[PDB]
Design a binder for this molecule. Structure first.
Ligand SMILES: O=C(O)[C@H]1CNC[C@@H](O)[C@@H]1O
Length: 456
């Protein structure tokens, strides 16, 4: 009983070109206490990253970046060698952790195995400028300028107070003075050090003035986004997660204006569904795959340079869960990122939906792939409506579909893409071949499902 909608692809309606390093992940800086985690020996986690993209960015930072201390003198402890640092829950101070040379050496090997680039947090909330300069120098020495994309000087400095790291009076002017002291110290040790900031959610009292003041000193603007609003908000449900988020649209417009004003591109350096490490029954469900895959394309269409989904440990919202000792597994959100991975890079095209007011949470994105083939990514985020999509504007002898599926929107497991789960070490191949019947094509999609179409 599907809602019958039209999708019109326009090869002449050119959007943004998706860069090859758009995808990415974000982790807590505390995880650097364990030299076995980001290590060339961690072949399982490296494989999960390679399946998400041949290029991509690993961001290390988060709330734990204010509680983590580089020590050039130190060696990892026995406890460090088993630490699994999941997303910080933001209720109280994180434990103090130490980063060692060995952990940085191992990170460099992990980046070589994955092919990903690095955004590395430095400790401006509690550390010293001179120790930041020393840490930056060792990271540059060992990771190298080609793989290091940016240092960041503090995570979410607008929330230092709420987290008890600065007094209530801390404001942009105070942070700018700290940023400049750190920047100057680091550039004495590392004259080519690249920076990004301010590593927080778009706002008018921090991110806009940061860009104006530091536009010649950073390579790009770094923003955060959680779909969950303030603690007072109508609480996050799956139903709400599938709906447009007007705050996201406004903050994105704000970042585009900053780019117009300053020349600085923007990257979403930390995002996930719900804050405080996620919400059980929302963040760890198949709805999060639909949400994440759709977000990747929404932000790419808006001109973002990339994204980094926060995670680690066994956090509710982590894309990849696990440890070196116990192994790693793809959680539901991973599968939305995997659909984006399989689509590949290229230039976005016009893809207009009609007759869709009874299926309003269906989204669609059309792509001219770098290999010249047209792809369409569809997210049927309607929880109660199947759709039948009449596709016009594509001329091809053959279309195939890979489906992103689970039996219920709130499933924590049972998620497949292309008729297969992801296996060990990120192993994935499609197991189900489905042609799209065809001028025009007609695609059915179940309620709460996704699809990737590829045309020959
Ligand atoms: O609250 C969250 O879930 C995240 C918010 N941004 C900072 C992260 O350390 C934290 O884990």
């Amino acid at each position: 009983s599907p809602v019958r909608v039209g999708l019109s692809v326009d090869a002449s309606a050119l959007g943004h070109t998706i860069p090859p390093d758009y995808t990415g992940l974000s982790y807590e800086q505390a995880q650097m206490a364990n030299p076995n985690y980001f290590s060339g020996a961690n072949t399982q986690l490296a494989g999960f990253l390679r399946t998400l993209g041949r290029q991509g960015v690993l961001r290390i930072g988060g709330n734990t970046s204010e509680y983590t201390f580089w020590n050039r003198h130190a060696k990892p402890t026995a406890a460090d060698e088993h630490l699994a640092a999941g997303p910080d829950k933001g209720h109280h101070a994180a434990a103090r952790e130490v980063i060692t040379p060995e952990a940085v050496n191992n990170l460099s090997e992990f980046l070589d195995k994955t092919g990903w680039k690095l955004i590395y947090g430095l400790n401006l909330g509690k550390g010293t400028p001179e120790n930041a300069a020393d840490e930056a120098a060792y990271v540059m020495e060992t990771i190298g300028a080609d793989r290091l994309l940016a240092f960041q000087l503090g995570n979410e400095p607008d929330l230092f107070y709420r987290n008890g790291i600065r007094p209530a009076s801390y404001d942009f002017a105070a942070y700018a003075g700290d940023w400049q002291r750190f920047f100057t110290a680091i550039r004495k040790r590392v004259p080519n050090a690249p920076f990004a900031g301010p590593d927080t959610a778009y706002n008018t009292k921090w991110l806009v003035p940061f860009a104006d003041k530091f536009k010649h000193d950073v390579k790009f603007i770094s923003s955060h986004y959680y779909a969950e609003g303030p603690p007072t908000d109508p609480s996050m449900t799956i139903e709400r997660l599938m709906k447009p988020n007007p705050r996201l649209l406004g903050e994105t417009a704000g970042l585009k204006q900053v780019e117009a004003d300053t020349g600085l591109p923007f990257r979403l350096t930390e995002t996930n569904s719900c804050y405080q490490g996620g919400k059980q029954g929302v963040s760890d469900t198949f709805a999060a795959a639909l949400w994440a895959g759709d977000l990747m394309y929404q932000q790419a269409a808006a001109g973002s340079t990339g994204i980094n989904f926060h995670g680690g440990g066994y956090g509710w919202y982590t894309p990849v869960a696990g440890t070196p000792e116990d192994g790693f597994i793809a959680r539901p959100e991973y599968y939305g990122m995997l659909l984006f991975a399989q689509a590949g890079a290229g230039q976005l095209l016009g893809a207009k939906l009609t007759d869709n007011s009874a299926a309003p949470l269906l989204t669609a994105y059309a792509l001219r792939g770098t290999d010249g083939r047209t792809r369409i990514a569809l997210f049927n985020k309607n929880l109660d409506a199947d759709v039948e999509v009449a596709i016009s504007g594509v001329a091809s002898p053959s279309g195939t579909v890979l489906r992103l599926e689970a039996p219920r929107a709130d499933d924590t497991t049972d998620v497949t893409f292309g008729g297969a789960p992801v296996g060990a070490s990120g192993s994935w191949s499609p197991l189900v071949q489905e042609y799209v019947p065809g001028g025009q094509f007609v695609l059915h999609m179940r309620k709460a499902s996704g699809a990737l179409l590829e045309f020959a």
